[PDB]
Write a protein that binds this ligand. Structure first.
Ligand SMILES: CS(=O)(=O)c1cc(NCc2cccc(CN3C[C@H](O)[C@@H](O)[C@H](O)[C@H]3CO)c2)cc(-c2cccnn2)c1
Length: 763
């Protein structure tokens, strides 16, 4: 209980809004949130097009991301904006104290790049909102008549936060001054504040809210005879009239000419000592020192990646991944019809499922919360169930207690049946990024249970102030065991849920196998996809068929059952462990009986013929490797040897840049959207690397073969990701096996960051 409380206090605040360039919120659904906007203004109409707020990636943005980050301490983010001619640094640091999750500060620094006009005007906005019934927030009025010559002080209070103050400092930089007549009524140019109220549920809509106020300011000009015969300067037309007061929205606006900086200082009243800019600077220097030391210990990069260039690469890949952590809160859109068409029992089921979807029975439910890392700030800034299992592998190395906290957050979503939606779109803010047709979640749709892999690592570590907190759950075995005790029933529920909802059919068909129970089919396939498997367009049996069996899914059930054996054992769940043991024995056999192709020398998904007979459908690629990737095969298995042959075969899967998702020899190589039909994906490559390492470091007939393949694939993968990062500044979603180029989405950190752990080695 005590470690839980300390963890809660430690993690409460952060820049937990990775969907935007920079903002903060605590891990509380309805509370205080901040966000930064900026944009150059060169004309009367450009600012609407230049202003930055939500993360994107296009020609106008060179790059951005965290140079260092630890959610307990803070970090530094750098932003390279071509359109606005600005290199920005946002430094964020947390200062523990008091009873309400402590205090924090940020420094915003903007430096014009070499190309920008030296006298560029940049508008900067700090937007502050607070949601909640019995909470207050008020901007202390200025002494000056038109705005603020110095700091802006917000004083607020809530049940969650107690009393606090939020200061936006005067800052450094030239403030442009207008000699226009308007300055008699609006002042010559100064910091301004507007305090406003809207219904709580729309406060997230900062850009429209800001622009509504800018437009009202412009309508006032038109009405008051400021016109094109003698127009005020653009930056003055777009400077809000000062009107501070009480409200649930506060817009703090500054205009700078040239380079600029200012601070944001959040002081929790219960902590006593109010935060200063000198504290900010001290705490930032200290967090950097601590980050450096921890990285060198946790991610000790091995040959041939010991050099400084690979260290900087690793720090960037890691910091972007952990820096992607967000807190999300709100309702989710779910189809709770459980329409019988979703059972997918007939041939042509995808048409029936489409029919049921077309009834649009889905509705909002919750509210829910989630604390999670994300695949991608600009494109996918929300929780994805199987991606998180990969995200947490490096995060757990860094801070096991944080990883366990995220696992716990995810499992807190699980419904009475054992279902967790594979994509977590929580609240209107999260929905704004997602086309409506893709928001609805389906209680029959699974996703790989990769979060079990993180639990496996934790279990292994358990068997063998911010410093203390990060490892408390391993350093105190009783703490770790109690965590497992509480989570175990939900893990079991999910296991049971997979067997209930994703069962395949042995008995209806001419199908002979060691066990009549162990067989699995992903629900939710369409003619060209199986999105729930995670390998969206990997070739599957055609047509889809209720008699399909998917070897990757059976393999995942294998993973779960092994974790449940280890955790059950730890908890003395004697009866459960007997049941799991029988299940694992059955899967080990059924993998062979239902999915092994002797002819092809690999595993295959299966289907049922036009003649109602079992048929293997082999498409050599990631799926073919699954029992190996998931660690299910014995080290001396002859099947494992044939799988190693395939892995190392340059004419099949082995490219100079990593393992191809699909064989060059497959009929579907490079076809259609070509998403999982050739490109190199880091998450699956990582699993291969780990399993090769396992074989390489044990006595057996394939030790040497595995050692060679491990060494080479490690090097190929790291170097591909490194070269692209050096050249483009990005982690990419996947890599071209012909050219080695990064392709598909950028800022994929994201499981591409698994590269840091591959470099550290020593699995
Ligand atoms: C030209 S495209 O056909 O290459 C292509 C395909 C897709 N698919 C839809 C889709 C939705 C959510 C997330 C992901 C990413 N990813 C897919 C992985 O396959 C999963 O395993 C993994 O969990 C999941 C999470 O990281 C993809 C999307 C885009 C896109 C969509 C919206 C905005 N921008 N771009 C482009």
């Amino acid at each position: 209980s005590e470690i839980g409380r300390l963890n809660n206090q430690s993690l409460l605040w952060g820049p937990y809004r990775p969907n935007i360039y920079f903002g903060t919120r605590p891990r509380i659904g309805k509370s205080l949130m901040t966000g930064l906007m900026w944009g150059k203004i060169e004309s009367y109409t450009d600012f609407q097009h230049t202003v930055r707020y939500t993360c994107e990636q296009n020609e106008g943005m060179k790059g951005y991301g965290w140079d260092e980050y630890d959610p307990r301490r803070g970090g530094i983010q750098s932003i390279h904006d071509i359109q606005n001619g600005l290199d920005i640094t946002t430094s964020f640091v947390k200062i523990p104290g008091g009873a309400h999750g402590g205090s924090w500060a940020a420094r915003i620094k903007g430096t014009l790049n070499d190309d920008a006009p030296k006298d560029q005007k940049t508008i900067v906005v700090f937007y502050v909102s607070q949601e909640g019934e019995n909470s207050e927030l008020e901007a202390v009025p200025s002494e000056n008549e038109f705005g603020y010559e110095g700091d802006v002080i917000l004083k607020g209070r809530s049940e969650a936060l107690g009393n606090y103050k939020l200061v936006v400092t005067k800052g450094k930089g030239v403030i442009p001054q207008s000699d226009h007549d308007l300055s008699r009524l609006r002042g010559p140019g100064q910091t301004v504040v507007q305090s406003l109220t809207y219904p709580d549920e729309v406060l997230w809509q900062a850009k429209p809210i800001l622009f509504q106020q800018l437009k009202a300011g412009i309508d006032w000009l038109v009405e008051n005879k400021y016109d094109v015969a003698d127009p005020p300067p653009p930056w003055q037309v777009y400077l809000l009239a000062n009107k501070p007061g009480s409200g649930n929205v506060h817009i703090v606006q500054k205009v700078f000419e040239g380079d600029f900086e200012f601070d944001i200082l959040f002081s929790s009243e219960s902590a006593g000592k109010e935060v200063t800019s000198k504290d900010l600077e001290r705490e930032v220097k200290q967090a950097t020192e601590v980050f450096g030391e921890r990285f060198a210990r946790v991610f000790d990069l091995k040959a041939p990646f010991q050099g400084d260039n690979y260290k900087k690469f690793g720090k960037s890949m890691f910091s972007n991944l952990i820096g992607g952590i967000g807190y999300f809160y709100g309702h989710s859109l779910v189809d709770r019809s459980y329409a019988p068409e979703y059972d997918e029992e007939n041939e042509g089921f995808w048409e029936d499922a489409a029919e049921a979807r077309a009834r649009h029975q889905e509705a909002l439910e919750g509210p829910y919360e989630l604390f999670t890392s994300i695949p991608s700030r600009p494109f996918f800034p929300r929780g994805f169930l199987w991606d998180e299992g990969f995200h947490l592998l490096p995060i757990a190395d860094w801070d096991i207690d944080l990883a366990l906290e995220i696992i716990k957050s995810w499992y807190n979503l699980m419904d009475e049946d054992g279902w967790i939606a594979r994509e977590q779109i929580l609240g209107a803010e999260a929905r704004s990024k997602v086309p409506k047709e893709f928001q609805t979640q389906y209680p029959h749709y699974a996703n790989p249970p990769t979060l079990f892999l993180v639990l496996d690592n934790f279990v292994e570590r358990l068997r063998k102030l911010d410093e203390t907190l990060s490892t408390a759950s391993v350093d105190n075995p009783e703490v770790g065991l109690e965590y497992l005790r509480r989570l175990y029933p939900l893990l079991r529920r999910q296991f049971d849920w997979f067997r209930k909802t994703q069962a395949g059919d042995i008995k209806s068909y001419d199908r002979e196998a060691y066990s009549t129970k162990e067989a699995y089919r992903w629900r939710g396939r369409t003619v060209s996809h199986c999105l729930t498997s995670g390998l969206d367009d990997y070739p599957r049996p055609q047509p889809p068929h209720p008699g399909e069996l998917h070897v990757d899914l059976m393999s995942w059930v294998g993973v779960m059952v092994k974790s449940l054996i280890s955790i059950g054992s730890l908890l003395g769940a004697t009866e459960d462990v007997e049941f799991y043991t029988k299940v694992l024995d059955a899967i080990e056999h059924n993998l062979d009986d239902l999915h092994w192709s002797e002819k092809e020398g690999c595993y295959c998904d299966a289907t049922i013929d036009e003649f109602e007979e079992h048929k293997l459908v082999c498409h050599k690629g990631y799926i073919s490797l699954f029992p190996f990737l998931t660690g299910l095969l014995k080290p001396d298995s002859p099947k494992l040897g044939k799988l190693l042959a395939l892995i190392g075969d340059e004419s099949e899967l082995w490219s100079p840049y990593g393992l191809r998702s699909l064989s060059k020899k497959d009929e579907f190589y490079g076809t259609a959207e070509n998403y999982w039909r050739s490109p190199v994906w880091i998450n699956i490559n990582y699993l291969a690397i780990v399993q090769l390492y396992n074989i390489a470091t044990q006595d057996g007939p394939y030790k040497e073969t595995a050692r060679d393949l491990y060494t080479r694939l490690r090097k190929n993968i790291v170097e591909t990701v490194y070269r692209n990062w050096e050249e483009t500044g990005f982690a990419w979603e996947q890599y071209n096996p012909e050219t080695g180029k990064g392709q598909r989405t950028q800022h994929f950190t994201g499981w591409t960051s698994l590269v840091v752990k591959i470099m550290s080695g020593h699995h």
